[PDB]
Amino acid sequence: YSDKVFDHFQNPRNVGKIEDADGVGTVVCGDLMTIYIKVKDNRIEDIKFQTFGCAAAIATSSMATEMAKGKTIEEALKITRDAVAEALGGLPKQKMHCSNLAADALRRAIVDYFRKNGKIDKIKELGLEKELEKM
């Protein structure tokens, strides 16, 4: 069990789909998730999420998108599984893969946004070559 995890699960932040989204990132069990971002001046002007999965899936997706909202892109790529696990107040083992879920959907969204706006160079910059290939 976990504390503020209940609050993000029951009252989730930024649920929805984004029409003409600027970047759409999507990811063994039964957890599937996508993140949608609109980007204005290198910022996340908006973020909405859709996930199917356990209570921790819901919670992390919520937290992750709350963490990224209004942040620069380089500021967002700083949202690892742990900055979100910690953000909530941690999670128990076995359910921790669900934090990796959210942090990955967000990375992919960001990586989507670069691959669409010819910013393939920044993809390299920047640490995220491996995740483009595995997509």
Binding site: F9, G30, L32, T51, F52, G53, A55, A57
Partner: protein, 378 residues
């Protein structure tokens, strides 16, 4: 609103009253040869007869164990080992509780041949597999009376005819005792598994009933209590409690199950109005206390936790609530891994009211809608 009765049950106040004096004033040990132990023995003996009486078990013996799990271990390992000189083939149902399925898997490591009996879309065993795979060397066949996950009642009377006294018949009655009639001669059982808590007695006790003549090797070795079949000083207070629960279930089971059926049906008729919902297990040959529904596009643990935050207790067969594998029962029915994720299991009991249901049916549809609206899958 507690709709998770098949994972735990409260102890009936009248059972507790029967139990308490054995824990503090008449705490004697049945093996003792003095007043304190004699009282102790009368009490165990009375309890034994109330449990036997509950299942029409006069032509056989009750052996007190620590629960249905041990009882099952003992039924399967106890019986096969002692009887291996007469063959080593065994039939077991694919939807049995893991306290049957794992012991059969142990015998598989000890030169026993075990075949698992397939089931159909609603979870009933295939009787013609049994009749087709029965051999002169088959010594044991283990099938449950009813299934506690999908609610489905099994063709045990039918199964008993086919076997025709050519192989011993084990029946786990964990889900049935209290819901439907459990008569060992009517269902032709040679061994019967009973759970105390499932009939509202203390946890941590149960019995295996054994037809006269069926001979077994023990599993718990030591003092030779339970006539050598289960060692350890007898847990008198629990046994008494278990006995008091049997007496209550005998007197009250019929009216209780008729009431729970009526509530079961109101649930199923209302739950199933929800876009894309499906009943698992048989729609009629089904325990009065079982609703198992699934919901497309969403995951079971989420439904379960949502419910809880409303004050509603329930259960799921989703992978997410274990291991990390879905329910072996659901797989056997032939659910895909996708289908099994959105599972909701609501099981009814003695302290449920129409108001519990009211509450459930005004809360659920909002839950299914809230989750669906976030599912990438909708």
């Amino acid at each position: 609103a507690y709709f998770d009765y098949t994972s735990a049950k409260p102890v009936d106040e009248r059972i507790l009253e029967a139990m308490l004096p054995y824990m503090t004033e008449s705490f004697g040990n049945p093996s003792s040869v003095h007043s304190y132990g004699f009282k102790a023995r009368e009490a165990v003996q009375e309890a034994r007869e109330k449990v036997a009486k509950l299942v029409n078990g006069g032509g056989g013996t009750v052996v007190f164990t620590s629960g249905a799990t041990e009882a099952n271990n003992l039924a399967i390992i106890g019986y096969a080992m002692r009887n291996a000189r007469k063959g080593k083939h065994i039939l077991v149902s694919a939807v049995e509780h893991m306290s049957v399925i794992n012991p059969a898997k142990f015998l598989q490591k000890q030169g026993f041949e075990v075949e698992y009996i397939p089931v159909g879309k609603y979870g009933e065993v295939d009787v013609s597999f049994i009749d087709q795979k029965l051999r002169d060397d088959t010594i044991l066949v283990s099938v449950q009376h009813a299934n506690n996950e999908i609610g489905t009642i099994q063709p045990v009377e039918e199964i008993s005819e086919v076997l025709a006294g050519k192989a011993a018949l084990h029946i786990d009655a964990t889900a049935s005792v209290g819901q439907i009639e459990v008569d060992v001669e009517k269902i032709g059982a040679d061994m019967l598994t009973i759970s105390s808590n499932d009939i509202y007695g203390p946890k941590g006790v149960g019995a295996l009933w054994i037809r006269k003549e069926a001979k077994l090797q023990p599993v718990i070795l030591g003092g030779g209590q339970e006539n050598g079949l289960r060692s350890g000083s007898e847990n008198v207070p629990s046994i008494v409690g278990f006995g008091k629960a049997a007496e209550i279930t005998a007197m009250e089971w019929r009216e209780e199950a008729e009431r729970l059926r009526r509530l079961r049906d109101r649930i199923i008729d209302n739950v199933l109005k929800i876009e894309e919902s499906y009943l698992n297990g048989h729609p009629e040959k089904r325990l009065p206390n079982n609703v198992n529904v699934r919901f497309s596009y969403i995951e079971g643990e989420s439904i379960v936790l949502s419910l809880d935050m409303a004050g509603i207790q329930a259960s799921t067969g989703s992978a997410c609530s274990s291991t990390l594998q879905p329910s072996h029962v659901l797989m056997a029915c032939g659910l895909k891994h996708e289908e099994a994720h959105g599972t909701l299991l609501l099981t009814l009991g003695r302290y449920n009211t129409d108001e519990d249901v009211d509450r459930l049916l005004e809360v659920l549809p909002g839950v299914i809608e809230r989750l669906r609206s976030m599912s990438p899958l909708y």
